[PDB]
Amino acid sequence: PVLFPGQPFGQPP
Amino acid sequence: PVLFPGQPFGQPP
Amino acid sequence: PIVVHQAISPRTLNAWVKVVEEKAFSPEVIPMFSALSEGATPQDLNTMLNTVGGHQAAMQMLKETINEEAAEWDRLHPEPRGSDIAGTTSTLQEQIGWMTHNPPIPVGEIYKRWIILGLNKIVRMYSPTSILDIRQGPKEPFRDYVDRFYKTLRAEQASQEVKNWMTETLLVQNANPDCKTILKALGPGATLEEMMTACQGV
Amino acid sequence: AISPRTLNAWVKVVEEKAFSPEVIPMFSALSEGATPQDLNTMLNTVGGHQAAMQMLKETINEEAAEWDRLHREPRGSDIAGTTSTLQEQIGWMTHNPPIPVGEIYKRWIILGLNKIVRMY
Amino acid sequence: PIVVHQAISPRTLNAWVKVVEEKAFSPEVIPMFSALSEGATPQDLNTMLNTVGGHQAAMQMLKETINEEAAEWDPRGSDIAGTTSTLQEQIGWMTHNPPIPVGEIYKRWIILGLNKIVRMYSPTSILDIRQGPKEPFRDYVDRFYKTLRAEQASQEVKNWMTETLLVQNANPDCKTILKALGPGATLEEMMTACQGV
Amino acid sequence: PIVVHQAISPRTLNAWVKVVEEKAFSPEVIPMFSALSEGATPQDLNTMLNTVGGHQAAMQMLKETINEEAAEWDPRGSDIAGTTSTLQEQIGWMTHNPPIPVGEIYKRWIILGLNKIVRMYSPTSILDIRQGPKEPFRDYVDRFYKTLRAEQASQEVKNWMTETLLVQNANPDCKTILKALGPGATLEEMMTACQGV
Amino acid sequence: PIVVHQAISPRTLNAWVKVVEEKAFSPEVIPMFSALSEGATPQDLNTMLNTVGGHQAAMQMLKETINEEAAEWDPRGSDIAGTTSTLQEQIGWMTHNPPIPVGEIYKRWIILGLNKIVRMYSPTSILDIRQGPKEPFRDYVDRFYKTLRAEQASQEVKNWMTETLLVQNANPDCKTILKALGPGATLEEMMTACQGV
């Protein structure tokens, strides 16, 4: 699950 | 209170 | 720009001015700003920010937030201080030395983080409607409604898990009655592509 | 970092030309030798058409998961750069032999964009 | 119970009588009687059954049903039933290594009779259960499974009832969703697919 | 219980059966079962679960849920569950210094299943709870928190529900007071600010 | 309880849970909890409080209220509360000549919190209680004293409420008799003087 929905691309965890 | 209303950004005291 | 300080391009300044002037305060302003502030001194940040002509009210809100963050920084440290970060009381040479020394203290990075933190609140305030009021029109094509909902979600503010739950449920729970049956029939594990293509004809 | 002119052009193509198969090779034209941070910056800038961006995000997620299952050595989430540093990516691009994280990221995004076009 | 026989506590029988005189032999009598008589010696169960004697018709169906199992058994049938054996004898059968369960077997027979009694007092047959036009689906199943637990057909027949008959009698608004869900859908899927309708 | 194993008192199971057959698996079943089975050996819990067998669908979800935790455990999974172990063995695990809690762990697994069961029989999803035009606010929250205790999402998601969603669905007359109170207001403040409206 | 610690009987907790899940924290919870926990060691009371955890908001007000009394106490505050002390230690404090009452003191703190909780869930403030045009006076007082037992002001303020405010809000037909009876009239006189009206 690298990118959750809604979050911006490249957003660190 | 670093920045006062009305004063420009970065204006010295 | 640090190479020694380098003057910001008038092209960059004009582009940022036009972005703020035309794009209202739609969310894509946040990364666009981050695009034009790579390795920029706090003085450069002030020069970029001041040039905004209109929307002066919203800018003021931003100013307020800066103070709060600055106060918190002044609470952390009893060495640049909170007002030093904003550049209101720091020279260009001192700022260059701070992030040119080894190791360098990221004054530009922390200032940019503060400004982004303010801009998030600005965007939320300028956001038209809450995520909960997004409902599909009876005749609205499904693609447009899905895109509208996702734009609104990108606007709203919450932690990651709240967004995950919102995506998983709210979109289905607010669709038009026709597509509601199809969506509830599809299941919980259907990807977005399947959901949109299922109602594509409607 | 990319020039504001180059970044602006990519915005106009998405906004003006809407979505069409011509977009995908166009994206390759402006992405030559782009670090993962550059890809993220260029992607986020898209204002409208957010649903398609969500689809692209889902495709990236599936591709990264498959890569992670197939296998500092890059991980599944390391490729997109959301869990990495600019220094590490610069080193990977500079270390011999280079390991093209940008190439695989571009491939995944191209596949997603092809899917989006096939939708329209 | 056994601890040497121990008589049933006085309030316990009060709970059992409260079940018979008030529940009208609703399909939930079987579990309650299966609990209040747990680990009871066969003489004790006769003590509880004396409270069923208030209904002349109901008590009779037990007397026949026990008798059939009594002769079919051939401790003899009239001994395990407590008609002839004494209290000490029953304990010896139960307090044995390995034990010969007399009390449990007696409890097995009664439930057969009580199952027969429930079918008689059952209010409606399963085939007449129809969903209301505005009745929530969550309540409809609970009404349905109560009737099905009473009708007491074989195991396989029940499965066909809950896989096709349940869907068939649903209201038209819900019938669309349930049929569209597909054959063989589990119970969990059906309720969620009709949570708010 | 343990005092040497002690069987569950007969009236206790009657109380547990009274919960299942009458509450329709309302969100309050979990506390009651968490009480009536306190300090119970793993064999005992199987005795209580036999009363859930009346609902074919409901009992099944427990069998799967226990099995998943049984294999995930790998006393083995089929031993702590009481499928294979004997009564004396379970006591030895519990009557140990330090003890290895078998009964409590078994009770931990069941509640997971019962949580799954409650979500199924839950009457309405949280998003459909709307305040009545004349409904007192004191009653509205009690209705709301019952549903929220059932929907059973993660911890963080619940907080967002009770800080924004609750205010959002309030009636217009109350919505004015609640919104005017300010963000982050605690539950105590909200009710007092709308005591008589 | 102590007889050596004795665990709370399983059915007792069932009664306590039945109070919380069904009475909606009506002003009568305080007496019932004051009874079901009589002579209970401080560890036991924590066992009962775990059933209040079903309401996230309600349980929180207890955690703060205990903590205030815990620090104000400074067996330490975290020891009498059972957060740190062990079962044997608590008995030693209680089984002493003369005893140091830990369980009773803990019970004193909780009731303060439960009093706070009741005021929150109280349906209406006292000043909004008005007699019905045809409502019998015998029922009106019972409704009134329930609210007054909840509002929980000081002792003196209550006396003024029940000597003037009660008469003031009565219906006009009864107000004539009550006012004519004279100031300072006891409760017994007022009801008899309006027995059938």
Author numbering:
A (entry chain Z), B (entry chain Y): 313 to 325
C (entry chain L): 1 to 3, 11 to 85, 98 to 221
D (entry chain M): 14 to 84, 97 to 145
E (entry chain A), F (entry chain A), G (entry chain A): 1 to 3, 11 to 81, 99 to 221
In the authors' words:
The HIV-1 capsid is a fullerene cone made of quasi-equivalent hexamers and pentamers of the viral CA protein. Along the body of the cone, the CA subunits are assembled on a hexagonal lattice, with the CA amino-terminal domain (NTD) making hexameric rings that are linked together by the carboxy-terminal domain (CTD). Twelve CA pentamers occupy sharp points of curvature—termed declinations—exactly 12 of which are required for the capsid to completely close. Here, we identify a Thr-Val-Gly-Gly motif that modulates CA hexamer/pentamer switching by folding into a 310 helix in the pentamer and random coil in the hexamer.
We incubated the WT CLPs at high concentration (0.27 mM CA) with 11-fold excess FG peptide to ensure saturation of available binding sites. Images of the complexes were collected for two independent samples, and then structures (6.0- and 6.3-Å resolution) of the declinations were solved, imposing no symmetry and using a large box size that encompassed 1 pentamer and 17 hexamers. The hexamers serve as an internal positive control, and indeed bound peptides were clearly seen as U-shaped densities within all of the resolved hexameric NTD–CTD interfaces. To visualize the detailed interactions, we refined one data set to 3.9-Å nominal resolution. The FG peptide bound in the expected configuration to the hexamers, with the FG phenylalanine and CA Met66 side chains clearly resolved by the map. We did not find peptide densities within the pentameric NTD–CTD interfaces. We therefore conclude that the CA pentamer does not bind to the CPSF6-FG motif and, by extension, is unlikely to bind other FG-containing host factors, such as NUP153 or SEC24C. Furthermore, superpositions with published structures of CA in complex with FG-motif peptides indicate that the closed-gate configuration of Met66 in the hexamer is compatible with binding, but the open-gate configuration moves the Met66 side chain into the phenylalanine pocket, causing a steric clash with the ligand’s phenyl ring. Our results suggest that CPSF6 and other FG-motif host cell factors, which are implicated in HIV-1 nuclear import and integration site selection, bind only to the hexamer.
